[PDB]
Amino acid sequence: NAMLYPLLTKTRNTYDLGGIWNFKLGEHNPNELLPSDEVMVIPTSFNDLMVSKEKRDYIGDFWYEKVIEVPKVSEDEEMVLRFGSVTHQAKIYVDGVLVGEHKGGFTPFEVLVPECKYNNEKIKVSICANNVLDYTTLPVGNYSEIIQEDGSIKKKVRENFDFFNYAGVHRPLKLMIRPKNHIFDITITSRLSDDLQSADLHFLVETNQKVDEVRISVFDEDNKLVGETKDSRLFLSDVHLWEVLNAYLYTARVEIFVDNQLQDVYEENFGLREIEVTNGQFLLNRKPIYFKGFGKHEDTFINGRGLNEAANLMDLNLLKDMGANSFRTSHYPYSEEMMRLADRMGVLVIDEVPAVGLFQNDNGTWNLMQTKAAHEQAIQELVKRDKNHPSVVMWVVANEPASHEAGAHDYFEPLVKLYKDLDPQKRPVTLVNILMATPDRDQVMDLVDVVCLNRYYGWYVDHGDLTNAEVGIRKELLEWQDKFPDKPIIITEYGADTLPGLHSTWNIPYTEEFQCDFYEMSHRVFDGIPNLVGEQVWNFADFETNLMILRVQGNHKGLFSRNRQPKQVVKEFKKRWMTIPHYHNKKN
């Protein structure tokens, strides 16, 4: 139900509830008042703000609590709490009463404040967050309980993924006063003309109640009126297209009317562009694109997975300065803020649900992977939240699932359909593939539009041995190309752990020089694979992980450090990506 970015309009009062909240790890009676012994900030991951390991590794319930003043709410209005997200599960209390609930740590939801409380001076909001991951959650966790002889129970999650399980309220929480009868959803659809110069627009507006009139006023980047309709249909002559690294955004002001008066007004941006996949190519505006960019993480010192709009912008500025043009939201939906920024900057985005960890670890006879419900929900929420973004060019169903094992096809078949059935634009959906699932073994890739591969020849296979890595990477890309002559291929991950300061004359893995050598070898291969249409390094920047022997205080495959300072290899990518055009047809 929370699919619309919270805006301030003359009919919608939006209040930011961020700041300091009373805070507690562990159990709490929401009928009672949390002390100010512990506090926590909203938004931010809580983990790094803890000074001890035991606290940073806490798993279970933890609470945020604040007494909040009730604004003026008129008879025809209602009041909702709107969360960008709570990680991973959340129960929301008003005055000690359970009033809403959510599962999924990376998508927004709203919670209605009971009408009977609108004439009160104050309300106490209590948020019971929970950071347990399961075989029933996304991402997938290995959950276990050990009794302490205390004998309290210690909960722990052995992540089935390579990123630290940051938890907390990572995204802005809003107190939202809006009309009872309001605009629930807006879907924007366009059919571009033969020559790509005009657009037949369809604005599909959802309401809960009867409306007399629905006026839509479209404005261009100069805020000049260029179209108006009362029937949901608009024809725009001589449009400006949304082009890679050269964005053009229209904004659709939607006003609804009952009995000759404004009931609700919302402003939704859209961009005009066409996506197609054919002949081993990714077409944007009917021209062949070459992806260059990064797998990313929402990760930063101090804030962990919490939203930092300034990091979004610093990254995006660097991306574009490098000559890059895209990135993937690995391994979970990013914040709305980041999406709106990619739109504004013309950056291509591969948008993914948190389906990472779908891989067991004899044996497995019993049904342990109960992920289907969460998966279906994740897909619905992402498409409903993100479908209007011109920057979203493709969906990902999973990252590195066990796609070579029996039962894989039948799990993904309906989920891929779901993206198609839900996306008005029917964008391509992909599946990101692990090295184990080789062309012969894999049994899922027939279902998808674009082949995405994470490959580390010269790092995990043939470690530090480029001569043989080259033969391996080339061999496999040729098998993929052959098995699917039709589909485009995108390297969604490739890189090499690199610690700033480590140096060698002898191409030594972990040194800055080896990072350069690794990418040279990789690009020499890619450039000779006709159906390979894009390359996205892992990772943009170094990032936090859990304790595992092959992680040297986090992942270090970043071109930048966690503090966003460049490694040696950045100069090299800048020379390469400024030489390859965005609209680059190889083939030729």
By beta-carbon proximity to a copy of itself, the closer residue of 72 and 210 is: 72
**Least distance from a copy of itself to the Cβ atom of residue 311, Å:** 5
Binding residues: 162, 399, 454, 460, 493, 538, 557
Q: Counting contacts by CB under 5 A, is residue 407 touching Mg ion?
A: no
Half-sphere exposure in the Cβ direction for 504 (13 Å, CA):
15
Look up tokens 């009062």; give the residue.
13
Q: x-or-dash pattern for a copy of itself, window 96-125, by CB under 8 A?
A: -------------------------x----
CB atoms within 10 A of CB 246: 11
Q: Does 313 bind a copy of itself (CB under 8 A)?
A: yes
Give 376-388 as a 3 state SS string.
HHHHHHHHHHHCC
What are residue 427's phi and psi, to 5 degrees?
Answer: -70, 160
- The phi and psi torsions of 345 (rounded to 5 degrees) equal -100, -10
35 lies in the site for a copy of itself, by CB under 8 A: yes
Residues 489-548 within binding reach of a copy of itself (CB under 8 A) = 501
- H or E, element range at 321: helix 309-321
Can residue 308 be called a binding residue for a copy of itself (CB under 8 A)?
Answer: yes
Q: How far is the CB of 81 from a copy of itself (least distance, A)?
A: 13
Smallest distance, Å, CB 265 to a copy of itself?
8
Q: Lay out the site mask for a copy of itself across 56-75 (x = CB under 8 A, - = otherwise).
A: -----------xxxxxx---
- Residues 319-348: x/- map of binding to a copy of itself (CB under 8 A)? --x---------------x--xx--xx---
Residue in 325, 328, 340, 343 with CA at minimum distance from that of residue 289: 325
Under the binding rule (CB under 5 A), the answer on residue 485 touching Mg ion is: no
Among residues 19, 35, 96, 364, which is the contact residue for Mg ion, using CB under 5 A?
364
User: What is d(CA 333, CA 382) in angstroms, rounded to the nearest whole number?
Assistant: 7
Residue in 405, 493, 535, 544 annotated catalytic = 493
Binding residues for D-glucuronate: 162, 399, 454, 460, 493, 538, 557
Q: Is residue 149 annotated as a catalytic residue, yes or no?
A: no
Closest among 524, 527, 535, 537 to 466, alpha carbons compared: 524
Reply yes or no on whether 110 is catalytic: no
Please report whether residue 414 would count as binding a copy of itself according to CB under 8 A.
no
Residues 6 or more apart whose Cβ sits within 8 Å of residue 382: 107, 333, 351, 353, 395
Distance CA 380, CA 107 (A): 10
Closer residue to a copy of itself, CB minimum distance, 67 or 578: 67
Residue 321, contacted partner among Mg ion, a copy of itself, none, CB below 5-8 A by kind: a copy of itself
Q: Is the Cα torsion angle 542, 543, 548, 553 positive or negative in sign?
A: positive
317 binds, among Mg ion, a copy of itself, none (CB under 5 to 8 A by kind): a copy of itself
DSSP for 477-538 reads HHHHHHH-TTS-EEEEE----B-TT---SS--TBSHHHHHHHHHHHHHHHTT-TTEEEEEES
8 A C-beta contact, residue 537 and residue 294? yes
Per partner kind, with CB cut-offs from 5 to 8 A, the member of Mg ion, a copy of itself, none near residue 115 is none
Closest Cα partner for 262 from 328, 313, 332, 214?
A: 214
Q: Which residue out of 400, 405, 535, 544 is catalytically annotated?
A: 400
Shortest gap between Cβ of 408 and Mg ion (angstroms)?
12
Check residue 306 for interaction with a copy of itself (CB under 8 A): yes
- Choose which of 1, 29, 31, 36 interacts with a copy of itself (CB under 8 A): 36
Cβ atoms of 330 and 296 closer than 8 Å: yes
Q: Taking the complex as a whole, how short is the minimal distance between the CB of residue 318 and a copy of itself, in angstroms? A: 6
Instruction: For residue 401, give the amino acid letter.
Output: P
**Cβ atoms of residues 109 and 83 within 8 Å:** yes
Residues with a catalytic annotation lie at: 400, 493
Q: Which residues bind Mg ion (CB under 5 A)?
A: 364
Residues that bind a copy of itself (CB under 8 A): 7-10, 13-16, 18-20, 33, 35-36, 39-41, 44, 48-52, 67-72, 121, 175, 221-223, 247, 249, 267, 300-303, 306, 308-314, 317-318, 321, 337, 340-341, 344-345, 501, 562-564
